């Protein structure tokens, strides 16, 4: 078996290997990628994802998110308080203030030791989940805006016609910034390109392993777990590597640089922050061997993680025993 120790893996395609995303995607599965959960991806040299950047500031962050946290250093949710609207010329500004800004350190390490002691004590502000995509059309290869979509793959594999469209989202982020543990809706693939500014640090637990973090997220949030079988789809919980670690949870982690893809994998676990001002895109896919964890996947139905129309037909077709109850959630 390929990678058993459940390595992130680093890939380095030539331009002729970024021809094709789902053959390479292929390809560092057969090198056992996919038992990390995340791998991170460097792309050719002669690539670019656009021209510049110098015309972003105009975005709109319509319902910017103030991630307000509660607990201890090493064990708390996060609430996303809805702000006002601002521009991402705003939004850079706010993130370069005094206030937002990232502190002086040393190195990475330095930085995440800073994160993981003090994030409780701030709010940084986080524009996700904003829909849109900063590729330029002409980019032909490992264009997120390009992708083939999760129904044309379940019709390819499956023969089965579904309605929903499959859209990217943008991300920006801050000092301090936070992505809560979580998978993918119905176990999804990622791929997330940081197309500028400072790193964003992973955390993922192996998908062979992830029922191990289930079982340690049910103990340190004992009743969000009775209030729902799925909670960490609510996407609100954090758990320090030093937690993680004096309870034995396998996981590993890497720091990605803008310019750099990551992929993530059917079921495996994630969490993550930023290191200052900077901006994301990533998606959903799938391939066929998602198909048996889109069926396994969980679902919440106490009704907090109310997610897309897309994935209606997904649990329709997938999981029509769960279906009824998961809609009854979903409305
Ligand atoms: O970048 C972020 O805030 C969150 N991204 C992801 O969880 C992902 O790409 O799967
Ligand atoms: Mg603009
Ligand atoms: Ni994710
Ligand atoms: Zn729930």
Same mark, same amino acid.
């Given at each position: *078996?390929?990678?058993?120790?459940?390595?992130?893996?680093?890939?380095?395609?030539?331009?002729?290997?970024?021809?094709?995303?789902?053959?390479?995607?292929?390809?560092?599965?057969? =090198? +056992?990628?996919?038992?990390?959960?995340?791998?991170?991806?460097?792309?050719?040299?002669?690539?670019?994802?656009?021209?510049?950047?110098?015309?972003?500031?105009?975005? !709109?962050?319509?319902?910017?998110? =103030?991630?307000?946290?509660?607990?201890?250093?090493?064990?708390?949710?996060? @609430?996303?308080?809805?702000?006002? *609207?601002?521009?991402?010329?705003?939004?850079?500004? !706010?993130?370069? &203030?005094?206030? @937002?800004?990232? #502190?002086?350190?040393?190195?990475?390490?330095?930085?995440?030791?800073?994160?993981?002691?003090?994030?409780?004590?701030?709010?940084?502000? @986080?524009?996700?989940?904003? %829909?849109? %995509?900063?590729?330029?059309?002409?980019?032909?290869?490992?264009?997120? +805006?390009?992708?083939?979509?999760?129904?044309? $793959?379940?019709?390819?594999?499956?023969?089965?016609?579904?309605?929903?469209?499959?859209?990217?989202? $943008?991300?920006?982020?801050?000092?301090?910034?936070?992505?809560?543990?979580?998978?993918?809706?119905?176990?999804?693939? &990622?791929?997330?390109?940081?197309?500028? +500014?400072?790193?964003?640090?992973?955390?993922?637990?192996?998908?062979?392993?992830?029922?191990?973090?289930?079982?340690?997220?049910?103990?340190?949030?004992?009743?969000? %777990?009775?209030?729902?079988?799925?909670?960490?789809?609510?996407?609100?919980?954090?758990?320090?590597?030093?937690?993680?670690?004096?309870?034995?949870?396998?996981?590993?982690?890497?720091?990605?640089?803008?310019?750099?893809?990551?992929?993530?994998?059917?079921?495996?676990?994630?969490?993550?922050?930023?290191?200052?001002?900077?901006?994301?895109? *990533?998606?959903?896919?799938?391939? #066929?061997?998602?198909?048996?964890?889109?069926?396994?996947?969980?679902?919440?139905?106490?009704?907090?993680?109310?997610?897309? /129309?897309?994935?209606?037909? /997904?649990?329709?077709?997938?999981?029509?025993?769960?279906?009824?109850?998961?809609?009854?959630?979903?409305?």
């Amino acid at each position: *078996a390929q990678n058993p120790n459940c390595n992130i893996m680093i890939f380095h395609p030539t331009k002729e290997e970024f021809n094709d995303f789902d053959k390479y995607i292929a390809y560092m599965e057969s =090198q +056992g990628a996919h038992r990390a959960g995340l791998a991170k991806i460097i792309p050719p040299k002669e690539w670019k994802a656009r021209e510049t950047y110098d015309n972003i500031s105009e975005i !709109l962050i319509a319902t910017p998110l =103030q991630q307000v946290a509660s607990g201890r250093a090493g064990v708390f949710t996060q @609430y996303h308080k809805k702000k006002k *609207a601002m521009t991402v010329g705003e939004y850079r500004h !706010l993130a370069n &203030s005094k206030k @937002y800004q990232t #502190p002086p350190h040393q190195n990475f390490e330095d930085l995440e030791r800073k994160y993981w002691k003090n994030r409780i004590y701030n709010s940084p502000i @986080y524009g996700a989940d904003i %829909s849109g %995509s900063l590729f330029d059309e002409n980019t032909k290869q490992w264009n997120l +805006g390009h992708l083939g979509t999760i129904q044309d $793959l379940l019709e390819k594999e499956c023969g089965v016609v579904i309605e929903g469209v499959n859209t990217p989202y $943008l991300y920006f982020g801050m000092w301090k910034t936070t992505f809560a543990w979580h998978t993918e809706d119905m176990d999804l693939y &990622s791929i997330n390109y940081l197309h500028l +500014g400072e790193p964003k640090t992973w955390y993922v637990v192996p998908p062979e392993h992830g029922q191990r973090l289930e079982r340690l997220a049910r103990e340190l949030f004992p009743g969000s %777990s009775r209030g729902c079988g799925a909670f960490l789809r609510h996407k609100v919980a954090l758990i320090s590597p030093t937690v993680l670690k004096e309870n034995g949870i396998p996981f590993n982690r890497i720091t990605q640089e803008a310019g750099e893809f990551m992929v993530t994998f059917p079921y495996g676990y994630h969490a993550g922050f930023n290191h200052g001002f900077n901006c994301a895109e *990533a998606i959903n896919f799938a391939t #066929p061997r998602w198909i048996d964890y889109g069926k396994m996947a969980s679902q919440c139905s106490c009704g907090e993680a109310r997610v897309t /129309f897309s994935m209606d037909a /997904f649990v329709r077709i997938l999981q029509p025993e769960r279906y009824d109850l998961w809609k009854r959630g979903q409305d």
